[PDB]
């Protein structure tokens, strides 16, 4: 039984400024990787001995995703403003957490995809991995949208695949 | 490698 979690965090500032993006990786509760937008050279970097053995393309590829998640978060903060009818001056924080629970037999036991706006529950992928739980009427919109477009399935792609796979690839360096 | 961009909210 092992775990893996990623916590992404964006925080909007005021006026002409892109949010502050933050992502940290956890291998069974221990931080092994971290990204931050503030750093003069914003890049993914290892937080644990073993992890420093991966090649430059891996960091260049994993850093590239970050660039995309920033574009996503930037756009999705705006969206959330409308949902809750909030002044465009206020600063807010959107956080994402995803990952997978592998069994003793290295299989897949549970999956995770969930969000939180300014600390409150927004939407979360249920256990059956095909339905969602929405916290408020605003999240109920995201849900309906994700119900029609097949959000679960989309994510269930990465989960059942790369996620489980790459987890094991990390459990070999320990 | 990790997940792809989530579907918009």
């Amino acid at each position: 039984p092992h775990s893996m979690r990623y916590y992404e965090t964006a925080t909007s500032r005021r006026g002409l400024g892109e949010p502050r993006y933050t992502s940290v990786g956890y291998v069974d509760d221990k931080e092994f990787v971290r990204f931050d937008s503030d750093a003069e050279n914003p890049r993914y970097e290892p937080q644990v001995p073993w992890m420093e053995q991966e090649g430059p393309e891996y960091w260049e590829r994993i850093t590239q995703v970050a660039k995309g998640q920033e574009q996503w978060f930037r756009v999705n903060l705006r969206t959330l403003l409308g949902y809750y009818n909030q002044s465009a001056g206020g600063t807010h924080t959107l956080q994402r957490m995803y990952g997978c629970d592998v069994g003793s037999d290295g299989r897949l036991l549970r999956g995770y995809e969930q969000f939180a706006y300014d600390g409150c529950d927004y939407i979360a992928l249920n256990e059956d991995l095909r339905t969602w739980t929405a916290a408020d009427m605003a999240a109920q919109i995201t849900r309906r949208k994700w119900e029609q477009a097949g959000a679960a399935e989309y994510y269930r792609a990465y989960l059942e695949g790369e996620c489980v796979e790459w987890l094991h690839r990390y459990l070999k360096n320990g | 490698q990790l997940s792809d961009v989530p579907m918009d909210l």
């Epitope: 756009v75 705006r78 409308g82 399935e153 989309y154 269930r156 792609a157 990465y158 790369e162 | 961009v5």
Partner: T-cell receptor
Framework: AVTQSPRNKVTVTGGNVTLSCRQT?????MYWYRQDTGHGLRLIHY???????QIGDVPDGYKATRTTQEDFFLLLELASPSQTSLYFC??????????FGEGSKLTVLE | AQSVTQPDARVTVSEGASLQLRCKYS??????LFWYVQYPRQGLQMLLK??????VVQGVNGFEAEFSKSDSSFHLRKASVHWSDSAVYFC????????????FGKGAKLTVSP
């Protein structure tokens, strides 16, 4: 619901044309495509959210502006006869899932 | 990098008869697969979509598409074609990290013979 205009326009080499597209939906992604028998649909420009622009596969001779969330404009400043085509506008809030407009037939005469 | 191939631009079948429209694409470890249909003087409409899971995507109107890991294909099939099904069918794909940039096939004009 994706509406674009003008549905039909004729112009001459050198003219200036603007194709408008408005979306009742609240989608972030908007696209401009051209359809030519023998090439199917080829992406010209697209946009993720208001005030965003990203070159497409065949952006030559075109310009685009995402003025607002619901508006996306295609701009032909120097019409070439080769630009004669059926143009399409699309929106999306999910990966690979596009809603299309009825299209704009543009003939660029010599 | 990403490529979509539809073999025949012209395909005719007798009403009631079976139908298969073929589609092969460049390999992606995880690919996002779609079919679009375009009736006369309209735009494209999404017909089917695949992301993951059961590789057979079933459409409510008798259409179905199958994802083939090995073939790297996404062929469209219908047991019995109605006359309304006359239209242009497009196969499109997008890869992880660009799942919002579709690659389209040249399409196929389906003529349902009377």
């Amino acid at each position: 619901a994706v509406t674009q205009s003008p549905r039909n326009k004729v112009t001459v080499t050198g003219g200036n044309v603007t194709l408008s597209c408005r979306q009742t939906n609240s989608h972030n992604y908007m696209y401009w495509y051209r359809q030519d028998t023998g090439h199917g649909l080829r992406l010209i420009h697209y946009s993720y959210g208001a005030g965003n622009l990203q070159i497409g596969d065949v952006p030559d001779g075109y310009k685009a502006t995402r003025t607002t969330q619901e508006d996306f404009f295609l701009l032909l400043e120097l019409a070439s006869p080769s630009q004669t085509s059926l143009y399409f506008c699309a929106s999306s809030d999910a990966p690979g899932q596009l809603y299309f407009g009825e299209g704009s037939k543009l003939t660029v005469l010599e | 990098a990403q490529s979509v191939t539809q073999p025949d631009a012209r395909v005719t079948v007798s009403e009631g008869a079976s139908l298969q429209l073929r589609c092969k694409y460049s390999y992606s470890a995880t690919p996002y697969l779609f079919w679009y249909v375009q009736y006369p003087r309209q735009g494209l409409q999404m017909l089917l979509k695949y992301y993951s899971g059961d590789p057979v995507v079933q459409g409510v109107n008798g259409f179905e598409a199958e994802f083939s890991k090995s073939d790297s294909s996404f062929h469209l099939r219908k047991a019995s074609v109605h006359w309304s099904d006359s239209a242009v069918y497009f196969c499109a794909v997008s890869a992880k990290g660009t799942g919002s940039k579709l690659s389209f096939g040249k399409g196929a004009k389906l003529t349902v013979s009377p």
